[PDB]
Coordinates of C-alpha atoms and ligand atoms in Angstrom, one line a residue:
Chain A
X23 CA -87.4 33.4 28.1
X24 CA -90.4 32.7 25.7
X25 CA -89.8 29.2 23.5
X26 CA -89.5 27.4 27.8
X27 CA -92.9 29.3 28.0
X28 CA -94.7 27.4 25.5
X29 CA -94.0 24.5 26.9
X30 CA -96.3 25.6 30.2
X31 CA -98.6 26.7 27.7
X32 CA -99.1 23.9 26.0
X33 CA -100.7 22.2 29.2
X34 CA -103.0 25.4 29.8
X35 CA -104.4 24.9 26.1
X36 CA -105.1 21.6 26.9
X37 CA -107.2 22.5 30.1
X38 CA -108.8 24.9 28.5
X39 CA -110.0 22.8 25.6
X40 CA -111.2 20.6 28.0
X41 CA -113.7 22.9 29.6
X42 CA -114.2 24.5 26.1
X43 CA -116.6 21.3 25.1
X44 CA -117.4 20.0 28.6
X45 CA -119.1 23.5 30.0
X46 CA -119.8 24.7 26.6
X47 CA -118.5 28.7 27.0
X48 CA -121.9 30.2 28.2
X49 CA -121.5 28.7 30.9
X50 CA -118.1 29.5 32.0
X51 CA -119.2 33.2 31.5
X52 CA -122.3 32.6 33.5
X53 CA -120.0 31.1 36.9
X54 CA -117.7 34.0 35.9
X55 CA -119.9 36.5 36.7
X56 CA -121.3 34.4 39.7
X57 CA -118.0 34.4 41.2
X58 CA -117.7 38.2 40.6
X59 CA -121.0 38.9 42.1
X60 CA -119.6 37.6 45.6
X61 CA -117.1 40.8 45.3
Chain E
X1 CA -77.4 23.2 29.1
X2 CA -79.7 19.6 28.3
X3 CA -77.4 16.7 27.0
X4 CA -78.0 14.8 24.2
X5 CA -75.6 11.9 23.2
X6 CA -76.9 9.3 19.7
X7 CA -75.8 5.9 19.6
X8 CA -74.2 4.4 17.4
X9 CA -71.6 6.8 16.7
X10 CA -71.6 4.7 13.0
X11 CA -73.2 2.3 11.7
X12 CA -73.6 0.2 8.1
X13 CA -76.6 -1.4 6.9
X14 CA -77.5 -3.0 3.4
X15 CA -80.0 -1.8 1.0
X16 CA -83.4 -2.6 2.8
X17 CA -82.3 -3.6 6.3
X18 CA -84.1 -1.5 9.3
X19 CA -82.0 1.2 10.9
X20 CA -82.6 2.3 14.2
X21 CA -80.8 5.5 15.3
X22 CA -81.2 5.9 19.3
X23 CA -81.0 9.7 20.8
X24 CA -80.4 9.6 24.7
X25 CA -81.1 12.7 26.8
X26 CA -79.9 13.7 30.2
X27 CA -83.3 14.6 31.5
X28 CA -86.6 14.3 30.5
X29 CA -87.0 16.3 27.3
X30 CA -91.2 15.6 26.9
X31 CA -91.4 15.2 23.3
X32 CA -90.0 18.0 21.7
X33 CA -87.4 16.0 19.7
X34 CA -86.5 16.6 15.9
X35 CA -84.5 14.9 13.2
X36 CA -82.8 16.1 10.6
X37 CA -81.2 14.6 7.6
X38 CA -77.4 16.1 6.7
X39 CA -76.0 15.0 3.1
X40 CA -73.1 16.3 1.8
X41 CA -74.1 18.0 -1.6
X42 CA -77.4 19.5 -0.7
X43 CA -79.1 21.6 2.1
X44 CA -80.5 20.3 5.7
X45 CA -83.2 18.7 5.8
X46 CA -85.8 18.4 8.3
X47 CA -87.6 15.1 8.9
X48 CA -89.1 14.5 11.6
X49 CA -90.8 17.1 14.9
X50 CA -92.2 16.2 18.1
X51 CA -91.0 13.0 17.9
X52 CA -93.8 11.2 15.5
X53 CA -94.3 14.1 13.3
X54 CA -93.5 13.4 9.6
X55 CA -93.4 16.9 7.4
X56 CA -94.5 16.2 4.0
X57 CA -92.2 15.2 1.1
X58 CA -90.3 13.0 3.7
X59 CA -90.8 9.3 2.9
X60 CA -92.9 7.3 5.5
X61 CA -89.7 4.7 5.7
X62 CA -89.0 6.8 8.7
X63 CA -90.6 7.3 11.6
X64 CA -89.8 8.5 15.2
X65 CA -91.0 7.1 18.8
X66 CA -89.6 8.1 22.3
X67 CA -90.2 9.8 25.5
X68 CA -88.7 11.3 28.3
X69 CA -85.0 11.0 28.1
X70 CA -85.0 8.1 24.8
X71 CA -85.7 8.6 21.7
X72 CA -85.5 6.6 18.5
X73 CA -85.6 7.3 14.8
X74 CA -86.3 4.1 12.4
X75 CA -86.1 3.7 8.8
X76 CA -88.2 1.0 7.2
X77 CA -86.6 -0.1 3.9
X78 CA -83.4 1.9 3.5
X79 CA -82.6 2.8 -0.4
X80 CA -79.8 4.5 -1.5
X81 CA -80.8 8.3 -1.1
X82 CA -81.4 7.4 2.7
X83 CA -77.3 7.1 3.4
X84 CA -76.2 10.1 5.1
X85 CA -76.3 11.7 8.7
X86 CA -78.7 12.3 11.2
X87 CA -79.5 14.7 14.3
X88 CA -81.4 14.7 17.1
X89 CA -82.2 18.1 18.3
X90 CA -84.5 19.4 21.8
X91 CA -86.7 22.2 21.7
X92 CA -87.8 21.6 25.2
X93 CA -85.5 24.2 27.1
X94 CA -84.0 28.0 26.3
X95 CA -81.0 26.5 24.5
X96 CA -81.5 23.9 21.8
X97 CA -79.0 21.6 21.3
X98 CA -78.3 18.7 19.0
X99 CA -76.8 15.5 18.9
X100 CA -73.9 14.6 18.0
X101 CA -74.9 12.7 14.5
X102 CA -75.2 9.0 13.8
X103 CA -74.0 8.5 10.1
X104 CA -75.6 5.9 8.0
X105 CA -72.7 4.5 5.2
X106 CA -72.8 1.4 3.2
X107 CA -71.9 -2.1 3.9
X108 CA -71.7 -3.8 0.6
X109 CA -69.5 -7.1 -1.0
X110 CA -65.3 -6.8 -0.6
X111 CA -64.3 -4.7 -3.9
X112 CA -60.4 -3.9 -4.7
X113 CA -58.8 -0.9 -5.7
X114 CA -57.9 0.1 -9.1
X115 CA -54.1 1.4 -8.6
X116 CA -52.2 4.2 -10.4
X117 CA -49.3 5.8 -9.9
X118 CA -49.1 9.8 -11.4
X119 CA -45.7 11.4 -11.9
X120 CA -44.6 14.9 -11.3
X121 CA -45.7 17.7 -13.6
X122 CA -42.4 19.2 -15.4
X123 CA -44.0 22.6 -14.8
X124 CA -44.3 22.0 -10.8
X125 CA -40.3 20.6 -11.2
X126 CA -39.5 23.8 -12.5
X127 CA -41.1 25.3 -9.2
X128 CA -38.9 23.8 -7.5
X129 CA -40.8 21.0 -5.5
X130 CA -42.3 17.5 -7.1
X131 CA -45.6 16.0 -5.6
X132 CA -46.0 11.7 -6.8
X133 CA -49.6 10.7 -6.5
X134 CA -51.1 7.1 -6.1
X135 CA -54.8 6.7 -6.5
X136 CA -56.9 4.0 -5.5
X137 CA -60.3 3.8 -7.4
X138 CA -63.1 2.4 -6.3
X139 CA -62.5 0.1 -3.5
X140 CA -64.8 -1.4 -0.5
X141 CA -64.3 -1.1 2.5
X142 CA -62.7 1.9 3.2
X143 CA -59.5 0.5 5.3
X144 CA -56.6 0.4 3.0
X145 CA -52.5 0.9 3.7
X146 CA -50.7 2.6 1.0
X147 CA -46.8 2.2 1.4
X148 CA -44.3 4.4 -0.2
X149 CA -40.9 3.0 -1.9
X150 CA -38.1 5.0 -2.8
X151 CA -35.7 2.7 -4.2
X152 CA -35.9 0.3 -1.7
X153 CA -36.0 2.5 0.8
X154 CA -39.2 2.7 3.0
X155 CA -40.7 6.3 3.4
X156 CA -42.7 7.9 6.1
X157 CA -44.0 11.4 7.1
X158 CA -43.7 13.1 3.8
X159 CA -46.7 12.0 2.6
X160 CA -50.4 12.9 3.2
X161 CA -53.8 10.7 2.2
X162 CA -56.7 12.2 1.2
X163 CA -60.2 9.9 0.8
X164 CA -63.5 10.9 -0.7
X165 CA -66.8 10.1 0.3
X166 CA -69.0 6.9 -0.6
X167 CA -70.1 7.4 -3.9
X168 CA -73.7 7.8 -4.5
X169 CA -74.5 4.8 -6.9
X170 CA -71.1 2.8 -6.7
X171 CA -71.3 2.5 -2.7
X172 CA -67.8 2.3 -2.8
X173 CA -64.0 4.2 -1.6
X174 CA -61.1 6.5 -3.4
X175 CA -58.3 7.2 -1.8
X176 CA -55.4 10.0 -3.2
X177 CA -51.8 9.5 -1.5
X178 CA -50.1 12.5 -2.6
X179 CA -45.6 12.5 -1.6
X180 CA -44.4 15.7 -1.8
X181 CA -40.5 16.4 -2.1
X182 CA -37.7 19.0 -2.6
X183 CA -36.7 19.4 -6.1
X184 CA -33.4 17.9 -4.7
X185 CA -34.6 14.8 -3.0
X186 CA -36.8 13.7 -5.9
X187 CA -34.1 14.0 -8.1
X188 CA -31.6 12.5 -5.9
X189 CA -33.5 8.3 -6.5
X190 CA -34.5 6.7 -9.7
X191 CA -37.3 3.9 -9.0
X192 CA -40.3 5.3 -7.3
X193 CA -43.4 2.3 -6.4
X194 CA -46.4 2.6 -4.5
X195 CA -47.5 -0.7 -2.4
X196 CA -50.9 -0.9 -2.0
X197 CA -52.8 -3.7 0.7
X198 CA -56.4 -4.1 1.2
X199 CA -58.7 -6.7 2.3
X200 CA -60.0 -7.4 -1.4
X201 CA -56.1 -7.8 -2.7
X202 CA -54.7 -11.4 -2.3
X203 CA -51.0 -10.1 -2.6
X204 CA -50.4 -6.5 -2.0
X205 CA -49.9 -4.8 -5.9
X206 CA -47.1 -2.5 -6.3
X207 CA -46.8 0.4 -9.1
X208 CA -44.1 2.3 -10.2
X209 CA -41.6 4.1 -12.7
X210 CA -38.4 5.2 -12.9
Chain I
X2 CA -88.3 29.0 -1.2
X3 CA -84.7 29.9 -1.4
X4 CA -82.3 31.2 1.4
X5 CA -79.4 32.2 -0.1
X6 CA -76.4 33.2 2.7
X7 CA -73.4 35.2 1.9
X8 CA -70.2 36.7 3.1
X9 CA -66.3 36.9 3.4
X10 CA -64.3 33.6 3.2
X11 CA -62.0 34.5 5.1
X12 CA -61.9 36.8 8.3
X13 CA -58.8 37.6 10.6
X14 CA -58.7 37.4 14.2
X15 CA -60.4 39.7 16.4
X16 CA -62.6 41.0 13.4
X17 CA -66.2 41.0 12.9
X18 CA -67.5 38.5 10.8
X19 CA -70.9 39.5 8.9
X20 CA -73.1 37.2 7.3
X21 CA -76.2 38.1 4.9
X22 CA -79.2 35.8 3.7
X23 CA -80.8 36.8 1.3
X24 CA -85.0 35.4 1.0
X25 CA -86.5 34.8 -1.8
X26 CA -89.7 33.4 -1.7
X27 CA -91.9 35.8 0.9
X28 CA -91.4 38.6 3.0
X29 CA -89.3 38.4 6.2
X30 CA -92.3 40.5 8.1
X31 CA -94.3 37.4 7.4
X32 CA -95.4 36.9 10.6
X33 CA -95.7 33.3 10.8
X34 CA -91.5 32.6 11.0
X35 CA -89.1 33.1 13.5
X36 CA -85.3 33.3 11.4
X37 CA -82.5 31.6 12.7
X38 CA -79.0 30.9 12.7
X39 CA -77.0 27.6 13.1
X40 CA -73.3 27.0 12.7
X41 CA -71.5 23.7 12.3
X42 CA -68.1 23.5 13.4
X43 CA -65.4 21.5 11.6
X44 CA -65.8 19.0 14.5
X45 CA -69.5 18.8 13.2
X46 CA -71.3 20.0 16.5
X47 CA -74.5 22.1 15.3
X48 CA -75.1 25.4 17.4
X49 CA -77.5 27.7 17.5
X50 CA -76.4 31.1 17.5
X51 CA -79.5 32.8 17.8
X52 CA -83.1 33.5 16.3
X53 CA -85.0 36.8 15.5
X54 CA -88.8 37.5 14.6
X55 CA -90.1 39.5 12.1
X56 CA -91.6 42.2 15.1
X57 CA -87.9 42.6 16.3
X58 CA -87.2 40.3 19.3
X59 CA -84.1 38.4 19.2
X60 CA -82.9 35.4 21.6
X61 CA -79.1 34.9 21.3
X62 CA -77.2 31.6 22.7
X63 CA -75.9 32.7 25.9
X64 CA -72.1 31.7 25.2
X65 CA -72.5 34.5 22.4
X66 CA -74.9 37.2 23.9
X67 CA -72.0 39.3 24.9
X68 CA -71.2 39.7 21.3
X69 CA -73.4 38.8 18.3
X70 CA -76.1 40.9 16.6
X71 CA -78.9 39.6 14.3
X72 CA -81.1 41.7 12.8
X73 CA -83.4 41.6 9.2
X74 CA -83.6 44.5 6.5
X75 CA -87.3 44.2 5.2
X76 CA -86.5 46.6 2.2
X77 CA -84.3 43.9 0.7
X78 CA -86.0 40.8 1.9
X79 CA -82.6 39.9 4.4
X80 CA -81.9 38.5 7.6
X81 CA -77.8 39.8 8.7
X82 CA -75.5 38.0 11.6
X83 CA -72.8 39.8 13.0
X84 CA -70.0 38.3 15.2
X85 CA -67.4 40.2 17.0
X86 CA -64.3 39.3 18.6
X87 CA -63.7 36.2 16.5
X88 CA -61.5 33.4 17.0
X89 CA -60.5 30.4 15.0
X90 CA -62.9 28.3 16.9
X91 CA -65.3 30.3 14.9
X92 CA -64.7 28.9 11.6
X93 CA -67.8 26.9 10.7
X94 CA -70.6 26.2 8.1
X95 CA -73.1 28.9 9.2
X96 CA -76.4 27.8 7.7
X97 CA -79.5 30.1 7.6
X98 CA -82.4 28.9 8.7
X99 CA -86.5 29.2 9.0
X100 CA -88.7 28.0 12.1
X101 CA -92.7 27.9 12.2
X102 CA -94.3 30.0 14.6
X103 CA -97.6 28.3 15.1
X104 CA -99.8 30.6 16.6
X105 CA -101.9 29.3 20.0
X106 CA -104.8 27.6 18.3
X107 CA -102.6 25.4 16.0
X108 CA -102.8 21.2 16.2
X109 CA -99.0 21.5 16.6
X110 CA -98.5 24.4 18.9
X111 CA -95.3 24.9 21.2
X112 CA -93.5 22.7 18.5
X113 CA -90.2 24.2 18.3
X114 CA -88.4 22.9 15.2
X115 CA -86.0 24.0 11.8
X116 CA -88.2 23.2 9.2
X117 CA -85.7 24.7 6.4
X118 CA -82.5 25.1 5.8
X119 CA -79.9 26.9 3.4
X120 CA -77.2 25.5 1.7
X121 CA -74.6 27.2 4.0
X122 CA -71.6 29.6 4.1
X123 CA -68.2 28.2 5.3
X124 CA -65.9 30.8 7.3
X125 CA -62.4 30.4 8.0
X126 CA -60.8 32.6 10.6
X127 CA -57.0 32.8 10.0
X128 CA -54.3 35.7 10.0
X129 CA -53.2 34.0 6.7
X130 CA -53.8 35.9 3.6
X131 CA -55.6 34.8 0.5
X132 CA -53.3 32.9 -1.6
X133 CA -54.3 31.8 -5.5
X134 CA -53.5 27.8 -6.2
X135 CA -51.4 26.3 -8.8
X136 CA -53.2 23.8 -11.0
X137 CA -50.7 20.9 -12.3
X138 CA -51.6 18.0 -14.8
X139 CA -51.8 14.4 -13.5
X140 CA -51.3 12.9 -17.2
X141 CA -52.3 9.1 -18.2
X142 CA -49.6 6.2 -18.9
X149 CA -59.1 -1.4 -19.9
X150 CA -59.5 2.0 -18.4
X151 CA -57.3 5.0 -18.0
X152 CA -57.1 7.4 -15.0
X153 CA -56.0 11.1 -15.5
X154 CA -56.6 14.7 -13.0
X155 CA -55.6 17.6 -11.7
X156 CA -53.5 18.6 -8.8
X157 CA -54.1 21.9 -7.2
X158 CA -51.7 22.7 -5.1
X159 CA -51.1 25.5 -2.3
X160 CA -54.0 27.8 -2.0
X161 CA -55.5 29.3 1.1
X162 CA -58.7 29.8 1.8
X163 CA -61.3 26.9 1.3
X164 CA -62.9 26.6 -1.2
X165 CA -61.7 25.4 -4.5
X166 CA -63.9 24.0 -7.1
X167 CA -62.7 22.1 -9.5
X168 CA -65.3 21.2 -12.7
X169 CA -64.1 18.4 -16.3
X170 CA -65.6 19.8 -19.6
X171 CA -67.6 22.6 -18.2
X172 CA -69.8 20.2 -16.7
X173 CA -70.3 17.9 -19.6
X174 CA -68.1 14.7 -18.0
X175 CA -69.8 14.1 -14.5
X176 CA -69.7 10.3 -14.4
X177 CA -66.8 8.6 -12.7
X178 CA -65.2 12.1 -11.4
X179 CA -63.7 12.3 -7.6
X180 CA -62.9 15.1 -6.4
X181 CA -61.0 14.9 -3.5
X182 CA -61.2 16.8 0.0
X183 CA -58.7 19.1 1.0
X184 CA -55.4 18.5 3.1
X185 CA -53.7 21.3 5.5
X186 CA -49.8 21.0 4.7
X187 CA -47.2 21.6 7.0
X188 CA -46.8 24.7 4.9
X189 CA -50.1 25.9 6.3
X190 CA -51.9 25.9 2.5
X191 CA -54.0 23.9 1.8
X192 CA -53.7 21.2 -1.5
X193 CA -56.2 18.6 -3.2
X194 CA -56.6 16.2 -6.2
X195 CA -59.5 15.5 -8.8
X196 CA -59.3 12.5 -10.8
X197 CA -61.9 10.7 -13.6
X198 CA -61.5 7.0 -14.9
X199 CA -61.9 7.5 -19.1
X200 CA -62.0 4.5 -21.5
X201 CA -58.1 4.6 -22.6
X202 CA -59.3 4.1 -26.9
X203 CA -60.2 8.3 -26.0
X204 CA -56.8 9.5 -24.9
X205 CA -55.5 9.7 -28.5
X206 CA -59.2 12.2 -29.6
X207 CA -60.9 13.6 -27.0
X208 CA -59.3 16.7 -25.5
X209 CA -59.7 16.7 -21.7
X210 CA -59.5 19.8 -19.5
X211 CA -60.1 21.2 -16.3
X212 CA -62.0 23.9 -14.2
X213 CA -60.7 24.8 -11.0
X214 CA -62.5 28.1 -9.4
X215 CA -60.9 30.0 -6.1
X216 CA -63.2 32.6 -5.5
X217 CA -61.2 33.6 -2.1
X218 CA -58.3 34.9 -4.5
X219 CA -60.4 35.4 -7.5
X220 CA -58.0 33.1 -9.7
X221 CA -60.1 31.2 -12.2
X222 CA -57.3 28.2 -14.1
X223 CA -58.5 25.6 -17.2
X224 CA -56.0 23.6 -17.5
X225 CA -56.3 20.5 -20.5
X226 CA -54.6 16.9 -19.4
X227 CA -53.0 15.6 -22.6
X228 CA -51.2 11.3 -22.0
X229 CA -47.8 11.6 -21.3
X230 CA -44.4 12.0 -22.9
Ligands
NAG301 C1 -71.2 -6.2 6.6 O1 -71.9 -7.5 6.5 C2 -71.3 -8.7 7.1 C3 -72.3 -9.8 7.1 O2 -72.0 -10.7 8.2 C4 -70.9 -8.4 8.6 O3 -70.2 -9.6 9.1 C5 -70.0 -7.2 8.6 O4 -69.7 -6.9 10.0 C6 -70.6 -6.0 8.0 N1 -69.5 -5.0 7.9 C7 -69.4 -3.9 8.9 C8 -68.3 -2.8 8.8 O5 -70.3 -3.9 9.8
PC302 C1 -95.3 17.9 25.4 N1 -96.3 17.2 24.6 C2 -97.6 17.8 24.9 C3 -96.1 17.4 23.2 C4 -96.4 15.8 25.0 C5 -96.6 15.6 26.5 O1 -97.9 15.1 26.7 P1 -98.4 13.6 26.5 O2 -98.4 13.3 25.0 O3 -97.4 12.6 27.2 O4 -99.8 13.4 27.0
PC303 C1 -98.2 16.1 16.8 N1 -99.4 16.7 16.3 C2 -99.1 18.1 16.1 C3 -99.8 16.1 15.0 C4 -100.5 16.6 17.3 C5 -100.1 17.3 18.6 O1 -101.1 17.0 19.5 P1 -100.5 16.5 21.0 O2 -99.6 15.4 20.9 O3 -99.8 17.7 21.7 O4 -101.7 16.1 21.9

């Protein structure tokens, strides 16, 4: 089942899109790597 | 499997009045919802995806709106090339389904037949069997009774109808009424008439030879 | 641009039925369609039988998985269906049929929809062999009204043409009608002004490609 994915997908596009302007990329790297360091 | 059930079944409009076209789903089907246009000469044609979308070449006369389990395709200012059939189709789960198809025919002013009666081909009398025609040309609305009468004698089962579809400028109805016999039979009477009653027709007109 | 499907008329009981659609405009490893295919029954409910991308992966409607096979031949530019184990209730209009993959960072992505369609292929499944028609006159007696009759032929379709295609404008060509005989029998009638009987020579073109019978037969007022 694929074509039932999309439709999920389409959601997690939109949330990413959001945080793609609002916390401009750099960022979301930067808190990334944050979060890694903790491990 | 998702359900999805149009209403009306059939409908009529005039030239110009607003159609509405109302697709009904048995859950919620979010938006994916497609329309299609199905005319009898040509290939499917898409109109309409996720609900609003208009693909290009399609006139902007129609134009979808829905959600959840009710949808509804509308045409503005219906013209002639707009009579045909329509589907609903859902993309949202694994197996799409469609509608069941509303079709979109004419309503236009009470027009009576044309009547004629055909006679047997000798060369299909030497076959062996003899088919009579009557033909009623170019009549509105579509209900008409065609009666067969073998001198005097009222006929029924022998006989098979056959109607075309509305004509593309005319708007209107033809109807074949083919009787088919043994060489016997047919040979057997003398006066053969065909009855014809429709709402257009003050007294039912009967044609005929011998 | 075009989608052009193809295949028998006719196929008996318990058979395989195999369909080809040929494209004609770009390459089926284009990688931006998914290929479909949709049938239409008599009882004009649209199914989908199945789609297939140009990397290999098929889905199949799950009342047919257990027998149908779609799969496309890039070095001809086709897309094949094959159905096995078929029934009468497989007779149908099986139209060919395009869908846009729209990759993730499209405006209109997850929009699942069948942006083209061919004109179709019509199937009949019946034990009933093919079966060329007779082709009577239905002769004249403001305006006349003449035809053609053809009679007893088996399978759909006939078609009938007046003048080669030079008289198109009050011509009806009627549907077909299943006789008690089991074959099937139509008419095809045009409305002429009756002052032409007497000079212009009328005939008709009926085609049966099913039996390969070709007939022109001229309508001449009657006697
Ligand atoms: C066509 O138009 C008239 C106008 O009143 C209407 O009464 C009639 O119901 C319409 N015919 C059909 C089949 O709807
Ligand atoms: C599925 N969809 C994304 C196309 C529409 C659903 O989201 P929304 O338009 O109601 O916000
Ligand atoms: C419908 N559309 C493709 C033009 C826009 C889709 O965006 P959205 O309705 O999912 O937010």
């Amino acid at each position: 089942n694929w074509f039932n994915i999309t439709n999920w997908l389409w959601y997690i596009k939109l949330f990413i899109m959001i945080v793609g302007g609002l916390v401009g990329l750099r960022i979301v790297f930067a808190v990334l790597s944050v979060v890694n360091r903790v491990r | 499997d998702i359900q999805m059930t149009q209403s009306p079944s059939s409908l009529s409009a005039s030239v110009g009045d607003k159609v509405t076209i109302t697709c009904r789903a048995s859950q919620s089907v979010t938006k994916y919802l497609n329309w299609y246009q199905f005319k009898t000469g040509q290939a499917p044609r898409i109109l309409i995806y996720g609900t609003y979308t208009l693909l290009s070449g399609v006139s902007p006369r129609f134009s979808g709106a829905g959600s959840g389990s009710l949808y509804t395709l509308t045409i503005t200012n219906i013209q002639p090339e707009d009579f045909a059939t329509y589907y609903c189709q859902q993309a949202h789960s694994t197996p799409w389904t469609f509608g069941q198809g509303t079709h979109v025919a004419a309503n236009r002013t009470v027009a009576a037949p044309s009547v004629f009666i055909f006679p047997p081909s000798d060369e299909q009398l030497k076959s062996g069997t003899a088919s009579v025609v009557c033909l009623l040309n170019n009549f509105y609305p579509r209900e008409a009774k065609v009666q067969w009468k073998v001198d005097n004698a009222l006929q029924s089962g022998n006989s098979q109808e056959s109607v075309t579809e509305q004509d593309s400028k005319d708007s209107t109805y033809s109807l074949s009424s083919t009787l088919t016999l043994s060489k016997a039979d047919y040979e057997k009477h003398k006066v053969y008439a065909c009855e014809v009653t429709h709402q257009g027709l003050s007294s039912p007109v009967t044609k005929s030879f011998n | 641009v075009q989608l052009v499907e193809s295949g028998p008329g006719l196929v008996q009981p318990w058979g395989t039925l195999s369909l080809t659609c040929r494209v004609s405009g770009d390459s089926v490893s284009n990688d931006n369609y998914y290929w479909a295919w949709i049938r239409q029954t008599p009882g004009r409910e649209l199914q989908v039988i199945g789609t297939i991308y140009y990397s290999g992966t098929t889905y199949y409607n799950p009342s047919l998985r257990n027998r149908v096979t779609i799969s496309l031949d890039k070095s001809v530019n086709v897309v094949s269906l094959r159905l096995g184990s078929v029934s009468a209730a497989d007779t149908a209009q099986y139209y060919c049929v395009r869908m846009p993959s729209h990759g993730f960072w499209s405006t209109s992505f997850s929009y699942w929809y069948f942006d083209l369609w061919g004109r179709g292929h019509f199937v009949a499944v019946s034990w009933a062999s093919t079966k060329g028609p007779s082709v009577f006159p239905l002769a004249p007696s403001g305006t006349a009204a003449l035809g053609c009759l053809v009679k007893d032929y088996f399978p759909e379709p006939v078609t009938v043409s007046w003048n080669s295609g030079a008289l198109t404008s009050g011509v009806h060509t009627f549907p077909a009608v299943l006789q008690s005989s089991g074959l099937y029998s139509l008419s095809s009638v045009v409305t002429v002004p009756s002052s032409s009987l007497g000079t212009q020579t009328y005939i008709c073109n009926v085609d049966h490609k099913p039996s390969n019978t070709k007939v022109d037969k001229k309508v001449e007022p009657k006697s």
